[PDB]
């Protein structure tokens, strides 16, 4: 008998393997696991970790946010482990070198028309195997509507969680506990 | 019928199973209900600082970018 925590076995949390059985993504994961092991590059380690993540942690990054994040250094290349989506609110693009998992058709067309280029992660591993001049970016991992229902329960004081309701008219979840005139408010 | 009214047995070890969690102690705290006429004047202070900084930044950017 020995008095250890968790009986002496180190416990890790989070993903350990790719779940997607996409052969191309499996090949990419193999390549970047090898790259992360054989080079010291935290760049490659981060990319190898992010290729493994669920969909909700590879959110899209719009063109406007891409070109805003890459404003100050214009000759670098931006690498996103999500998808790049178009932004109709953006009036003009400018000469972006972007590596990404996937591009929507509109975003790809706009980037090539602006004269930049779209890169896959195998091309990124070919040309910048260490990540020189490569800026790691990610989209908003907490903007999705599911997070709007998370956190403190709707009903706890000063809670911002969205409740689960069929509809959102005046007669749905809006009388008692949501205004001072009916018992209390939140 | 008659039951155990109350006990605190096992409650402490339940509490220590996931530790006695400490408050996070964030660097900044909301000033919502705190010292009006002081934090409003602090808002004015910060606005003055930002405007004085930003007009210098605009001047320098304009004169370096023609």
């Amino acid at each position: 008998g020995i008095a250890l925590k968790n009986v002496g076995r180190i416990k890790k949390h989070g993903r350990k393997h790719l779940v997607s059985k996409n052969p191309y993504l499996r090949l990419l994961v193999k390549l970047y696991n090898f790259l992360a092991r054989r080079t010291n590059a935290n760049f490659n380690k981060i990319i190898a970790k992010r290729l493994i993540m669920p969909k909700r942690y590879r959110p899209p990054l719009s063109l406007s946010k891409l070109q805003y994040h890459m404003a100050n250094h214009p000759n670098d290349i931006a690498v996103v482990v999500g998808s790049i989506t178009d932004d109709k609110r953006l009036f003009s693009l400018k000469q972006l070198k972007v590596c990404a998992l996937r591009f929507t058709e509109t975003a790809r067309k706009r980037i090539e028309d602006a004269g930049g280029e779209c890169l896959t992660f195998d091309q990124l591993a070919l040309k910048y195997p260490t990540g020189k001049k490569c800026v790691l970016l990610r989209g908003p991992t907490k903007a999705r509507t599911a997070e709007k229902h998370f956190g403190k329960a709707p009903g706890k004081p000063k809670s911002k969680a969205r409740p689960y309701v069929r509809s959102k008219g005046r007669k749905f979840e809006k009388a008692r506990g949501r205004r001072k005139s009916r018992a209390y408010k939140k | 019928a008659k039951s155990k009214n109350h006990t605190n047995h096992n409650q402490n070890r339940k509490a220590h199973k996931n530790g006695i969690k400490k408050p996070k102690k964030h660097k900044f705290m909301s000033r919502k209900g705190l010292d009006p006429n002081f934090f409003r004047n602090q808002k004015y202070c910060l606005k003055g600082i930002q405007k004085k900084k930003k007009e210098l930044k605009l001047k320098a950017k304009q004169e370096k970018n023609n």
Partner: protein, 223 residues
Amino acid sequence: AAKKIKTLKLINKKKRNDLRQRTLRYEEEYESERKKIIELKREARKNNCFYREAEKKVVFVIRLKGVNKLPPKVRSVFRLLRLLQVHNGVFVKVNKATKEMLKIVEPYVTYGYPTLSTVRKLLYKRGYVRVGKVRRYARKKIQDNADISKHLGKYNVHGIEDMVYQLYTCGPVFKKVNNFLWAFKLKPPRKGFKAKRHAFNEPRPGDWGNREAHINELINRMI
């Protein structure tokens, strides 16, 4: 294309020489300290005066009880001392803080002042070391000075004799050496205990508490 091995070998040779010189100086220091205490007690007693020796600065603690039925404070102190199994042994440097920690665990341990030969025996025949990355230590028997050099070399502690010196004389690098050293896993005593239930200082046979120099014979039977 072959200068690297030559440089590595030369550096190893220089390290061996420095370790040898350091160990010879250590032996001279042990002998000088023993002779000094002998002659100084002699002089004190020749004069009409008393001489009180320094406290020993380092203790060796052996756990006595198992893991069941222990108060939370005792369990916490045990974890802080790294005494997790029934016959585990550790070196604990002596100060007010550790003495007060040892007080709350006194009924479940026995400890005492180790002396140099027993320190050397413990490290040489039961000395295992925490080798790996930080928090990934992988207990390994010493068998060589390479890992001692790798982890403790920046404090010039290349060598098991350096480890022995720092443990025996509570020197500048004691916390690092003691932490680098995996907790000793001792055998049951060769002739048995007397009664783990009762204090060593009780008039009846007993084992727990501070044994002072008497820890050496128990360690020798347990090694």
